[PDB]
Design a protein that fits this description.
about 325 residues; alpha/beta; TIM Barrel; eight-stranded parallel β-barrel; 10 helices; globular; binds chloride ion; PI-PLC-C1; phosphatidylinositol-4,5-bisphosphate phospholipase C activity; hydrolase; PLC-like_Pdiesterase_TIM-brl
Length: about 325
């Protein structure tokens, strides 16, 4: 083939930043396999904010285009709903497009009390994108859990995922700094999947929660509730750390888990995170592929040829 679990592809961190891509449509047209978005749920008032730093309104390249004819025409700095609108417009204009993973960092976690929890997140994505999403319900099928499904049968072929979006969730830097014991994005969303599954409602889910932070063994052992563990089939961590000798990355490949390796440029010997040479970047992607990455991410927006790279995972 390959399948979504046997390939290595390339992502762009903070793809909503105007400095990288004038419009979000440009991020979508970059060829990248993974585009990362920073969302805020605990700002005041309505909407999920899109912003790198503490939001004042939004700071993004998203336009909220109503259709493809409107892409690259509107004022930017739109919110998550606006981003999703751009995605839908672009999707409708590019039937059979490459599968794209939207990696969402929930900067400040969820805000269920304020109407921005896992259920409302799913509902918004369903409203905007509908059938274009490949989510946990799709992967899991009739299996008891996502883990059971993925280990036994793996992911669909890349060809079969044409015209699909997938979503990954990681906890954010702000909730990592909370002195209180509010549940983090990972436990909250995984618990949501567990609860949906118990209610026979997994089909309405839209995103895969990831275990964030490179670790040896089975990283899911960090969760004291074993019932949450099989809802994590995506792992996200520092590339240099994954390559430092302490972690057996073949484990992920054998089990068909998705492995996102961040800051790919910081793997020694370090190369530029934005403007490396094409040769340097390609070599780095190949190195990470051999080390069983599903995705290698950095800021290589100047290198769309590299961003489009898809190679076999694990040699
Ligand atoms: Cl697979």
């Amino acid at each position: 083939a390959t399948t979504y679990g046997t390939s290595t592809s390339v992502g762009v961190h903070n793809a909503y930043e105007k400095e990288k891509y004038r419009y979000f449509a440009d991020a979508l047209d970059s060829g990248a396999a993974l585009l990362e978005l920073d969302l805020w749920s605990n700002a005041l008032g309505r909407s999920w904010r899109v912003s790198h730093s503490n939001p004042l309104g939004n700071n993004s390249n998203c336009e909220g285009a109503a259709n493809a004819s409107e892409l690259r025409t509107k004022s930017r700095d739109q919110d998550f709903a606006g981003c999703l609108s751009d995605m839908r417009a672009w999707h409708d204009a590019h039937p059979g497009h490459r599968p794209i993973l939207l990696k969402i960092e929930m900067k400040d976690g969820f805000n269920a009390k304020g109407g921005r929890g896992p259920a409302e997140f799913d509902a918004l994505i369903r409203q905007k994108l509908g059938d274009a999403v490949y989510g946990p319900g799709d992967l899991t099928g009739g299996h008891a859990t996502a883990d059971e499904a993925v280990r036994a049968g793996g992911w669909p072929s890349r060809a079969d995922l044409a015209g699909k979006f997938l979503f990954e969730l990681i906890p954010g830097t702000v909730e990592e700094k909370n002195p209180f014991d509010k549940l983090w994005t990972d436990v909250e969303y995984a618990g949501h999947l567990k609860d949906l599954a118990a209610q026979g409602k997994l089909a309405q889910s839209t995103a895969f929660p990831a275990v964030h932070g490179a670790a040896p063994g089975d990283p899911r052992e960090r969760y004291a509730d074993p019932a949450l563990r099989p809802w994590f089939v995506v792992f996200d961590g520092d590339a240099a750390t994954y390559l430092n000798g302490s972690i057996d990355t073949s484990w992920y490949d054998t089990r068909h888990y998705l492995l996102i390796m961040t800051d790919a440029h910081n793997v020694p010997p370090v190369i530029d995170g934005t403007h490396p040479t094409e040769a340097e970047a390609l070599a780095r992607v190949r190195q990470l592929a051999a080390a069983h990455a599903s995705f290698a991410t950095a800021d290589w927006y100047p290198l769309p040829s590299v961003l489009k790279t898809v190679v076999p995972r694990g040699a």
